[PDB]
Every structure is written in C-alpha cells, then in structure tokens.
Design a protein around this ligand. Sequence first.
Ligand code: NI
Ligand code: NI
Lengths: 295, 304
Amino acid sequence: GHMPDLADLFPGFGSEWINTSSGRIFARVGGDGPPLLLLHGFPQTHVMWHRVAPKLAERFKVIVADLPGYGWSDMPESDEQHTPYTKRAMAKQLIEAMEQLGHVHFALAGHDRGARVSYRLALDSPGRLSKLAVLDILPTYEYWQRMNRAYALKIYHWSFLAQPAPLPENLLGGDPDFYVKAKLASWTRAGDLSAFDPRAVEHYRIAFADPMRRHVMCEDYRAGAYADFEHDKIDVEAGNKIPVPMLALWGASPLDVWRKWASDVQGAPIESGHFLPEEAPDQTAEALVRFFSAA
Amino acid sequence: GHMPDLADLFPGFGSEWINTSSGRIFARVGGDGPPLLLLHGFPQTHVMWHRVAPKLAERFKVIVADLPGYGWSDMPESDEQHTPYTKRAMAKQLIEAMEQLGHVHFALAGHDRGARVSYRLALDSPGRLSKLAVLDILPTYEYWQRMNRAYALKIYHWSFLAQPAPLPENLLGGDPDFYVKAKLASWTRAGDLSAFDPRAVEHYRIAFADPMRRHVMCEDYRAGAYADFEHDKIDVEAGNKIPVPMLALWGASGIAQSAATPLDVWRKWASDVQGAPIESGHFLPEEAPDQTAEALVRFFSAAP
Ligand code: NI
Ligand code: NI
C-alpha cells in the first residue's frame, strides 16, 4: 500500500525498480532489441510516452523511466547547489540504471527536462550513446541567453520555480491540481487538456499533489538557473559539440541553434504544441522509429 | 463592526474618501502649505509614508493616497487591456482626486508602483506638476529592456504576477501572509522585517489577505507587462522627456540599482533631474526615514 494503484497505460510492459547510488529509478520496460531510454520532463512522468512507446517497442527494448525524484523514482536529498537535480547528476544516475538493466551503450530520447538530461549526458558521456533525440527544447544556456521581456513572460516558471525555498513550494501548495493542469494546457496547441489521455493526467496530478515531489521540481528549476547554466556555459566557452548522431524535433505551435551544439543533427517540425508524444503521437513515433532504426 | 483593528499612523491627519469618475480614492490629509501627493506601491498601502509624512507636513499639505484598487480605494472593473490599472489610467484618476480636493496643480512623490504612476503622469500631463520625485525605480521600459537572466531571477514577480488570471491569484491564495512578508523582507537591506513598524506591517498584511486586493495587484503587474511597457516605448521612440523638475532617489541596495546606475537612466527620460542614493534597500521611507524625509523636504521646499 505504499504506492497508489494508478492506471496501466503500457500493456505488456514490465515494471522495474532499478538500483543506483543515488536511489531507485522506476521504469516501464517493453519490446525487444537494442535499448532505447525515454525520459519525460515537467510536470509529467514516464506515462507521457504511452502513445508512442508501443510503436517503438516493435523494434527496440523501450525503457520508460521516471527522472530522479519524479513520478515513482526515489528522491535523493538535495543540497545548496541542487546537485542531485542537476542534469549532470541525473544523467550519471540514469547511466547507472541502464547498466543495471544490462546496457552500457544505448539510444536515448528525451522531452523537456528529460531532453536536458539527454543533451547533457551526450556532452559529458558521448560514448554511452548510439543516437540521441531531443523533443521541443533548446539548451538551457540558450534559453537564458535569449532572456528578454518576451521570454520572461513565456517561460516565467524558469525564474519563479528557481526562487529560493520555500517560496515556490508555499505557493504551489495552495492549489496544486490547478497549477499542474494549467501548466499542461498552456503549452498545448489547443490550450486545453484535450490532447491528453485523462488517465495520464491523473498520473501527473497525483505526482504533483505530493509536496515532496513539488520540492524536487523546484530543485530541478533551481539547478536549471544556476549549476546547469554554468555547465552549459563552460561548453559554449570551449566550443564543445555533441558528436552523437542527433535528432531535434520541435512543435510548430531550432536546428540552427542545435548545429552550434552538435556536429551531426537532423531535425523536423511536428504539428504540435510542446507535448509532442501526446499531441502528435503518430508523427512523433514515425520520426523516432526512422531515426533510431538507421543506427 | 467589519473594520479590522488597524493603527492610526498619521496623528492629526484627516481621512477622506475622494470621488472620481472611476471610483473613490482613500487618502490621509495633513499639514499646511502647498499640496504634495504621496503615492505608495506594492505590496504596501498609503501607510508606508507614516515615518516621513509628519516632517513633510511642516511645510506642505500632504495628501497620502491609496492607489486605485489598493488599500481602502475602490477597485475599478478591469478589462482585457487591464486599463484602469495602467499607470496612464491611475494618473488620470489621481488627477481627478486632486481636483476634487481643490488642487489643479501639485507636487508629487511616488515609490515603486506609485512612482510609475508619477512619471507617467509627468509624461502625459506635465502641466499638472510643479515638481516630481520618484523613489527606487527606473521606467518600466528600462526594467524590461534589461530583463536578462540575472534580473529575471531578481524581479521574477514581474513575469509571475503578469501571467493570465487566475494563475497567480490561485497561487497567492496558497499562503498570502507568507508571500507578503516575504516580499517586504526580501527587498530590504537587512532581509527581514526589522525596518518596518509592526503596525504598518499589519496594514500590509490585512490588505494582502483579501483576494480581491490581490487580484488588483496582479492587474497592475499585467498592465506593467503590456500596456504600460507599450506607452513607455512610444515615448522612448519619440525622444519624449519629462520636463518637470525631478528627483530620483534610490536605495544603494534597492531594486533600481540592480539593473543600472539610476541617474544616467533618468537623464535619458527627463530634462531636469537630480538624484541621489540613500543607504537603504527598496523601502526608502521606512528603512531610511530621516535621510529620505530630508532629501524630499530639500527638493520640494524653497527653504534651505
Ligand atoms: Ni505498498
Ligand atoms: Ni463594520
């Protein structure tokens, strides 16, 4: 009874609680063949890939993991530098998890915060990856460098969530169900929850209802403002590029920027707002299947 | 029996609820001399002037007003453009209020959002003012143009409170007393509530405890993100400067200096401006009441 019995949106996938030095990672695992790790972002959990994972599982062993501190993954204790929720740390932790499942090398697709873990994994540890896909992001450095009135208004959560504790936590506690649903709706093409399966929304809501989980989200954004930015800035200053074959997808509702950060990148627009795998599952799955099958 | 227990922080001053075409303006009115309108900002009310008002009332008729929608003033119905909470509209309204009190021309000092009302007033209706003081601000256009990562983090509330309704309102409802005391403390030099009279804090707290009053604050910030920014941009593009003799005061540890050295910014916006730093964070008349009152008396008074 320690865990809620939430809807199973991955028919035929197993569940794994995977040990790491920083705590357990929860993942759904399905299909067969070369490993493909899929990483969600904010304010979601692993279930965001439920529409695309079955298609990918035709050809790959699909591992659909909750980020450190998200969903059902354990929440390592943070520190003043937000270390465990930096993308650098998260990437190392997910490397440990993949090794547990038997995979020293793997393919990787990330959305939103998961995409940030992914490109950072690729900068830090490019030998681990065969191919990388990033969905609907630019690097953290780029979002901060382009900070201005327009961006401040559009990605206000980058500055609000990064305020020192307990400011955002105290505020999010006063109607979390509203916040999580507003955050999802606001970044869809439709501006409502129509693109999401209601059962997925319930996963997202249940996670966001726990104050400890909301604290981790804020630690993630604090890292995003400070250590993750600094990590990125070091790469920019040395002109470091990802050498891994890369695919950037983005919602038409970015390749030039990615070509500054990667020496082998393909890209495509998807008719979607932010949540590509749920708003445009067929187009997203087709793009990923093609890219990861070329190897 | 609905009025909360709130201290009278202006011994001897009258209390007026002043009619206008957009709602009543609440003010304390004291002293003797030519008129000086004092305008607070966020998340405060007129009571923030309580440490400097007596000194100014030795030479001036001091009118200490709650901004439209704030404190005890009425809350005008807003619209999609947040019109009545735009600085242009608040200025027109406070002009109506001064005319009701019998003052067609007056001197004006503002702090924070009240200072934004003040310089907009000076741009729009310069013939109304004899002299203008703005406390711990730069123009709204200037804060937006300087909104890089560091300043986005420092003044995050500019983007947060400007989100579409009801998002900030629903968040603030979560622990409003923590939020207001957090804002008050964080913008001080000491980083705590030591600079404030606890009786004043209770005024701020009671105001902020009302969801309707918080909604007005969000509307102000929305105006600040949209229409107010666009009005400023028009003036910048045209080269329009404030002609009214002007004083910019700012905290050495305040908000305005975090963006830029303030006097050189104000010289771009105004043709006769003087300025000086005060040893203080953002809340100059409460953190540094003797220095602030002296600066203001010397600037507004013809006597040395
Ligand atoms: Ni259990
Ligand atoms: Ni009563």
